[PDB]
Amino acid sequence: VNEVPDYHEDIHTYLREMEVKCKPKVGYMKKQPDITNSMRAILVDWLVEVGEEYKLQNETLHLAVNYIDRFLSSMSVLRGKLQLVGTAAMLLASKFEEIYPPEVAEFVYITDDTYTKKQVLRMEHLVLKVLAFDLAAPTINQFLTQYFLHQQPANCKVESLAMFLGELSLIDADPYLKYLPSVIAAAAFHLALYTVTGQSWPESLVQKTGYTLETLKPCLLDLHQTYLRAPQHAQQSIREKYKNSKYHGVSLLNPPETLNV
Amino acid sequence: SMENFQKVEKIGEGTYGVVYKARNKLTGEVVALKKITEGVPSTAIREISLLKELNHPNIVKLLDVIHTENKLYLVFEFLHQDLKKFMDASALTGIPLPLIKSYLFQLLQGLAFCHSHRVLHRDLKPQNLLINTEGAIKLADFGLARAFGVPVRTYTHEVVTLWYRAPEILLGCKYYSTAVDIWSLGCIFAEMVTRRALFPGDSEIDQLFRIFRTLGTPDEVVWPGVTSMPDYKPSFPKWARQDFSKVVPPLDEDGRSLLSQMLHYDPNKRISAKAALAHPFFQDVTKPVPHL
Ligand SMILES: COc1ccc2c(c1)/C(=C/c1cnc[nH]1)C(=O)N2
């Protein structure tokens, strides 16, 4: 019952439909006059640090990022206000997903008093208005945990490494805004499985998802390059986080040099 | 913003704030207005976000949200009465069997739709089930609900109004799932038939002992793993399981069979809402208007 046998295919279908509706605009950053891909990377890396400091769920982080990308798809923001958007997004995601969210004062503290309490609460309301309260969005993690049920047998390193790779994709809007969560999750699962065990995307997931290594190839080639370059990336908080024994130290594993795909 | 609504009277109150009956002056529609620091409450954020996609004939509809600087109004569909008040008003007449069966059939359709959309309700009790004069019954109050993942992760402990709370929650299990809302509906089926709560405890331990006195103290045969659960104690008294026909004497054989599957100890064996819709108890189900 913890794997909901009678509902898991209905839920998967439903998430498939909702990811298309919650999808940010692929080309938004070129329409932002004052912010760039690089400034977004810095913000998302900081949110990883905040989630680590307050011991928040990984789902909470993924939700906050969906909210930010949706908000910036329609609202032009100056570089001095980008962190105010991020803070309000993380506050909303914590209220939705956490048993014990941090208090608003804690969210003011982590911005170093760049912003007042009143500014954070005002931005909360604006983000709710712009998104029309539509907060129950699908994430990469929601698809990953379903895919993990197809392992024969379950491997903790495969699970943590796929999580790590999905997380790295959050940092880089080019190229990852062009792929759906269910696709990033599938490429991440295949790459982690291959790296740890030598195995490949299983037939049982072809039956569930309709995705094959053929349709996954473009995202897989991107993700592979990202994994190879991760030690040199300007942003490092995800690699540091996934050194921890909580995540079986998976950021210390060596990427495969080729995929044969 | 609210210029088009005329308040009529107060109809409810809770943790959230207060509910009024009101009437749209332009369309004539009757509505329920739920009126609502740390910014917007997390219970309101969950209610609004989760009801945006839960459009179903047996789930109360969220029609609009009016979010000012100062107040937040949720504009909901209005229904005449709650099932708790109807059960009181049916005192010595009883509620006819065709109406009980229709209401249970409808509650199971609403619940299966929630579960198919990854939502746990977590507070099903007669006060949160609303009825109208045409024979509909609908699930209401999603402020205690929560969107789940597959498989589930640990969520808020000690949930569900005590009298309707499942044993896996009382025993402190790390995980709970869709089976908790089924337990609640089993308690509600018994209550419609008798008119009194099935397990009316006054503390968590008294709640457990009342359930054990009716269904037997569970062991490793009936419920594998039970003796390792965090709040299980080997000193619990060991009560014998009672012939199910003594639990709700007026219920026939099919009714008894469905109730026993909704109140199974082991959450892995408890019946799903989806599976229950095909139970032989519902072979002759219709949808009559309520008798009062
Ligand atoms: C508590 O949340 C809700 C939500 C929607 C609602 C009611 C209550 C509600 C309450 C009620 C009580 N008796 C008649 N109606 C109603 O008609 N619609």
Residue numbers in the entry:
A (entry chain B): 172 to 432
B (entry chain A): 0 to 35, 41 to 296
Paper text:
Members of the cyclin-dependent protein kinase (CDK) family have diverse cellular roles that include regulation of the cell cycle and transcription and, in certain cell types, differentiation (Lim and Kaldis, 2013, Malumbres, 2014, Morgan, 2007). CDKs share a conserved protein kinase domain that comprises a smaller N-terminal lobe linked through a hinge to a larger C-terminal fold (Endicott et al., 2012). All CDKs require binding to a cognate cyclin partner to remould the kinase fold from an inactive conformation to one capable of phospho-transfer. We have used biophysical measurements and X-ray crystallography to investigate the ATP-competitive inhibitor binding properties of cyclin-free and cyclin-bound CDK1 and CDK2.
AZD5438, Dinaciclib, and SU9516 bind with low-nanomolar affinity toward CDK2-cyclin A and show up to 16-fold selectivity for CDK2-cyclin A over CDK1-cyclin B. Our structural data show that cyclin-bound CDK1 and CDK2 form the two conserved hydrophobic spines. In addition, cyclin-bound CDK1 and CDK2 form a series of interactions between their respective N- and C-lobes through atoms that derive from (1) the extended hinge region of the C-lobe, (2) the base of the β sheet that comprises β1-5, (3) the C helix (which is part of the N-lobe), and (4) the activation loop (which forms part of the C-lobe). In total, these elements form 133 and 145 inter-lobe contacts (<4.0 Å) for CDK1-cyclin B and CDK2-cyclin A, respectively. This network of interactions correlates with enhanced stability of the kinase fold and could, in turn, enhance the binding of small-molecule inhibitors.
